[PDB]
Amino acid sequence: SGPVPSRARVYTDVNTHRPREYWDYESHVVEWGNQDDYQLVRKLGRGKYSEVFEAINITNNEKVVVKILKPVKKKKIKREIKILENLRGGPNIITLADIVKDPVSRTPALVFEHVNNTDFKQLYQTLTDYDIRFYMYEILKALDYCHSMGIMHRDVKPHNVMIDHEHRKLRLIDWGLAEFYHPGQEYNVRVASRYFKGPELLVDYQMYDYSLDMWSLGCMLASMIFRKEPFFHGHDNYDQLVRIAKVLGTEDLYDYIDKYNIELDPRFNDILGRHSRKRWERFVHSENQHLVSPEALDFLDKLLRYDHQSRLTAREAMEHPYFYTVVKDQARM
Ligand SMILES: Brc1cc2nn[nH]c2cc1Br
Ligand SMILES: Brc1cc2nn[nH]c2cc1Br
Numbered sequence: 315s316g317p318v319p320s321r322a323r324v325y326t327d328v329n330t331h332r333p334r335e336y337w338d339y340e341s342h343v344v345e346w347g348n349q350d351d352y353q354l355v356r357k358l359g360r361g362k363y364s365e366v367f368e369a370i371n372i373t374n375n376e377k378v379v380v381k382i383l384k385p386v387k388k389k390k391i392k393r394e395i396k397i398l399e400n401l402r403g404g405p406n407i408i409t410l411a412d413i414v415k416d417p418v419s420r421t422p423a424l425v426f427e428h429v430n431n432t433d434f435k436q437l438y439q440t441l442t443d444y445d446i447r448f449y450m451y452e453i454l455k456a457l458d459y460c461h462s463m464g465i466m467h468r469d470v471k472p473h474n475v476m477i478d479h480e481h482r483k484l485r486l487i488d489w490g491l492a493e494f495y496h497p498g499q500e501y502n503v504r505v506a507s508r509y510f511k512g513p514e515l516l517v518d519y520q521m522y523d524y525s526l527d528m529w530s531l532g533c534m535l536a537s538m539i540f541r542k543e544p545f546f547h548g549h550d551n552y553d554q555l556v557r558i559a560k561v562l563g564t565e566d567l568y569d570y571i572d573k574y575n576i577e578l579d580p581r582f583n584d585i586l587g588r589h590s591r592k593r594w595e596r597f598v599h600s601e602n603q604h605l606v607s608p609e610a611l612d613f614l615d616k617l618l619r620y621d622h623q624s625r626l627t628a629r630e631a632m633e634h635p636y637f638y639t640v641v642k643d644q645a646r647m
């Protein structure tokens with residue numbers, strides 16, 4: 315008949331057990347601050363869909379980052395605000411410091427803790443084996459945390475991971491696509507950037523969960539250990555699934571379609587073809603062999619699964635052998 319329902323393996327009912335006000339972001343009332351407490355210093359390079367600035371809080375001379383919320387549904391604005399407030403103080407989550415409106419313009423803006431504008435994309439193709447493990451483990455802290463708090467990020471990519479490499483600090487940013495997980499809810503599949511979209515988004519399976527973020531993490535990991543940016547390099551959303559099909563194989567893809575009774579968009583009929591599941595060794599060469607190990611491949615393999623239920627949870631990922639020396643070293647500090 316229709317698609318078969320799905321529920322998250324972990325943290326399934328955490329928002330149900332909360333008070334209504336925790337997740338019911340439409341009912342949130344914002345005390346809007348005054349943007350004249352802040353003065354914009356300079357525009358930060360964040361691509362074409364960004365109004366992000368370094369600024370100075372003139373009450374205490376403290377550096378901050380300001381994000382002007384581009385015209386968008388008021389629904390989205392309260393959602394990002396409520397998520398950031400709910401996650402405030404969590405491991406490697408960017409800290410929302412203030413919420414303000416321009417007196418004249420009335421345009422809302424978010425004020426964050428200062429970070430340097432050095433994202434993971436700029437660093438992540440030049441890391442040692444150890445540093446890939448270290449920063450992957452730091453990202454997993456943020457993901458396990460937000461998932462445990464009933465929230466999925468939905469836009470996990472190198473550009474949304476801010477790194478202070480000198481201080482070995484990491485912050486997960488841009489919660490503008492993040493959503494509260496509710497069992498049985500059918501979500502918008504037009505989320506994330508093409509190269510990091512999970513198969514669920516690509517085949518239009520709407521009843522997804524936290525596991526979406528773990529596919530994204532998998533693409534990031536593959537990119538780093540194989541030095542291939544992006545790992546799945548599609549021309550468009552349809553070809554994106556074909557790129558994945560050529561690595562993961564068509565057998566697991568079609569079993570996944572059958573398991574959830576997904577109605578596959580007719581454009582896929584000719585382009586998917588028939589492909590074996592490729593061994594990861596295929597991608598290893600002399601310029602990346604130092605980043606690739608049995609532990610890394612075993613870990614990667616357990617992230618990049620068509621079936622969202624089969625993927626490691628963030629906490630399961632953190633327990634993998636790949637991270638043992640990171641866990642050991644962390645206990646010593
Ligand atoms: Br300060 C400040 C000045 C602005 N001009 N336009 N948007 C703005 C936001 C802030 Br915060
Ligand atoms: Br830099 C920076 C960029 C962001 N985009 N969305 N939230 C953000 C927070 C910081 Br801090």
Ligand SMILES: [Cl-]
Pocket residue numbers: 502
């Ligand atoms: Cl949405």
